[PDB]
Ligand binder design. Structure first.
Ligand code: 2QG
Ligand code: 2QG
Lengths: 472, 471
């Protein structure tokens, strides 16, 4: 069973001895620190952590004993606030005397802004605020995935609109392949859910269950996929029978969309001779709602995509759309799911546009780039103490390293406000109390062991919409 | 509760309809295909076998659940209920799979077979690649273990060169990555992969993972000392940084203590506060309880050098037998900001050029150690190499025309020792020819049971550095 007493950085066990004596309050905030190409971030992930890890009765005398035994050996010393954790168990039945205020999930906030704040509600548990820093900072991941996925959606949106004239099927042009590419099962469910904030196409099944029990949707499921092949289902037929494999699969799924990886041996031969000639008759007859999706999986991503399209363009009836861009027959589409991140995605669509190919021809797939190739450095997701009450007197606290002004933190009690021009501003030193701005956009989401404010996954999706999507 | 029927890439649900008819055997393998990472530490599989694969993993509830989810997920019913119902009825929910693997901890050069997977029942031909996704995630404990070990080599070389020994080596790369990872489960897995090479960690979660799935003779596989964060310094007010330092070192006067000293001015705190104001509280400390000074900002190498040059002028510096300068035993340094395998090399090299010994310093790494790693780093890949259809086996493989590096091995594989004592993977079942001695892989899993396991002690012994093997 999970133990919150064991879910922190080791040195934080010794921190209750290091704060100024007569300290009754520790107040900390969380921000995606400004780096003086991601200027706005999607706040998502906190609600999962609150329900799964922080709420209810998270302390028992057993959990205190087990933490005591481990830390004795880990430190080779008795340094462990057993009294402190005992107080929480007896006074609050193991519930955390903590209040967390947060911006609503899905919200797209510029960087340098407070996203949530953490403070203890009991003077005795001043140490508790930063004990749970490690666990809360791990929200850097869903936030980073949601943000990075959304930025890729912006790029897709821009190029789709410019070459097709609309945004039809935009939410299905970036498919989640990264289930095997992540560091664990729990990460998989978390990362996939952050992607579904922006798109509807996923293969990482784990994200479906997470959303259902922690956020919920009106629809049965927030993500979808189609029957598709891997290299094993092709290669198993023997190197001489790739056509037999191709034909078997497209016939098995003759009435639904189907994707077939075609680069096992020679991607350019499979498109030109096999799909293009041998099995062309099984393709042209396919329904509009059930196209063949050809899938290259190797080589230079941009060069391979063009050449694939160029091959298919001469084997199949291509039409020029109203915007002047070339379009495959509706029974034929392409998915590029190899070596795609935000960088390469930009190069492909721009490459496709230069060659007059429409983005409606292609959807993308991303694995490690989508879910794993991300760090806390990217958005500078940081958790810092800004306000402390000692001897009844409150002071504004901050860090400001001489050799890195970028790492400077904010002072005092914070609040998030809408500017007169409709932008965002973070007020420091408790200046938000002056009422010179609107109401604090942060909402109490957690207090004294109970989640006080929840958001459906439907709301989070609505909040994180792109601007061009609102413009429709 | 976990459900293995829901723990695979979606499209694999449709794969049982794609293999050649009358296929009875699907046999697949795993490899680190193809800064250089020429050899990898195999570690992590045993966790996945125990936590996720062994025992009754299939029930009538889990089948119905997967039935319901996939129906909405595909907007159609393509889920193989009959196949999973066969497992439940015939084997009481136990997976008819056999997995052979190189012993955990082993350091194997790239391009070799690390483990293989195959079905043990003709009916469950489709089962082999169903569990691809879950098994491929071993890429992460393997990569962390490998990258952590590679960094250990770097520290070993420069420590031995500047100090003459390897004392304190397994404590010179501390885990700070707990907050820097994507989840709790990852933290435990990543930290345990780190603990294969080192003993210094702050990621608590890894300790319990090891005890449950691997086990050690010692109570714990990892250790830590009391230390400060920015909040325990800055909470005293900017005008009272000296008061915080003094309070902290006084609380932990008899145990090792580390104090982050860059809240405002790293070079001021080192020269004026530690070096003048509180100098009397430092030189009195025990050799078993040194003050550890922790910078946490600026250019990593430049900061470390200037810090050391400052302390060397405020404190009695000694020159060891190898001619390298050394702080007094009650004073050390830890650099835990911006440290990865690349920067770690630059720092120790920069220290050596400035005649500073590596014994003066330990390192802390967070994202670089646990998070900034991907599956393509060691090209960790899982591929089918052998199937039996119509009673006839065939050697299958991929070979993309535009990428020879994605070529996959053919036929039944085996791992052998070369006459010169190296590793070789034999393909096309040529291991049966007995020309290369016995197969080095062991059956670790069969029909729902872990059949061979290793202690964390064995793994550590297996993962030792050749320099450590020398004496
Ligand atoms: N193609 C492939 N691959 C794959 N699944 C199939 C993805 C299907 C994407 C099809 C295009 O978008 C759509 C997604 C959903 C819907 Cl309703 C319609 C269209 N899964 C992998 C591959 C590689 N690694 C892991 C999983
Ligand atoms: N100090 C710090 N950091 C921290 N706690 C304590 C870790 C223990 C470090 C022990 C270092 O022993 C040494 C050993 C040998 C030498 Cl020559 C110098 C030092 N944990 C963090 C920090 C930042 N972020 C996450 C965790």
């Amino acid at each position: 069973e999970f133990n919150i007493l064991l879910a922190t950085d080791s040195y934080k066990v010794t921190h209750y001895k290091q704060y100024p004596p007569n300290t009754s309050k520790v107040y900390s905030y969380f921000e995606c620190r400004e780096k003086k190409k991601y200027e706005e971030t999607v706040f998502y992930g906190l609600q999962y952590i609150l329900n799964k890890y922080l709420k209810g009765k998270v302390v028992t005398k057993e959990k205190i004993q087990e933490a005591k035994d481990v830390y004795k050996e880990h430190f080779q010393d008795d340094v462990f606030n057993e009294k402190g954790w005992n107080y929480i168990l007896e006074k609050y039945d193991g519930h955390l005397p903590i209040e967390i205020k947060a911006v609503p999930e899905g919200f797209v906030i510029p960087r340098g802004n407070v996203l949530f704040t953490v403070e203890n509600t009991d003077p005795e548990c001043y140490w508790l605020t930063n004990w749970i820093e490690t666990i809360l900072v791990q929200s850097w991941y869903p936030i980073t995935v949601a943000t990075n996925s959304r930025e890729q959606k912006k790029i897709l949106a821009k190029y789709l609109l410019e070459t097709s004239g609309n945004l039809d099927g935009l939410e299905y042009k970036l498919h989640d392949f990264g289930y095997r590419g992540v560091s664990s099962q729990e990460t998989a469910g978390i990362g996939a859910s952050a992607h579904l904030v922006n798109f509807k196409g996923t293969d990482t099944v784990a994200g479906l269950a997470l959303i259902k029990k922690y956020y919920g949707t009106k629809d049965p499921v927030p993500g979808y996929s189609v029957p598709a092949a891997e290299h094993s289902t092709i290669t198993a037929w023997g190197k001489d029978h790739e056509k037999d494999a191709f034909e078997h699969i497209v016939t098995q799924f003759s009435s639904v969309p189907v994707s077939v990886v075609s680069d096992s041996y020679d991607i350019y031969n499979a498109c030109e001779k096999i799909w293009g000639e041998d099995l062309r008759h099984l393709i042209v007859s396919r329904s509009t709602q059930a196209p063949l999706i050809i899938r290259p999986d190797s080589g230079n991503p941009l060069d391979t995509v063009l050449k694939v399209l160029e091959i298919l363009g001469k084997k199949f009836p291509v039409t020029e759309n109203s915007k002047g861009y070339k379009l495959l027959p509706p029974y034929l589409r392409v998915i590029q799911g190899d070596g795609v991140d935000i960088n390469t995605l930009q190069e492909i669509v721009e490459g496709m546009k230069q060659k007059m190919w429409s983005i409606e021809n292609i959807a993308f797939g991303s694995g490690g780039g989508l879910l794993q190739k991300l760090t806390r450095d990217l958005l500078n997701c940081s958790f810092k103490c800004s306000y402390v009450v000692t001897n009844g007197l409150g002071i504004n606290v901050f860090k400001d390293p001489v050799a890195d002004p970028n790492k400077r933190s904010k002072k005092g009690r914070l609040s998030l406000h809408r500017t007169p021009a409709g932008n965002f501003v973070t007020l420091e030193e408790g200046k938000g109390d002056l009422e010179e701005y609107g109401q604090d956009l942060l909402h109490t989401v957690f207090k004294n062991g109970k989640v006080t404010k929840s958001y459906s996954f439907d709301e989070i999706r609505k909040n994180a919409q792109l601007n061009i999507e609102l413009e429709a």
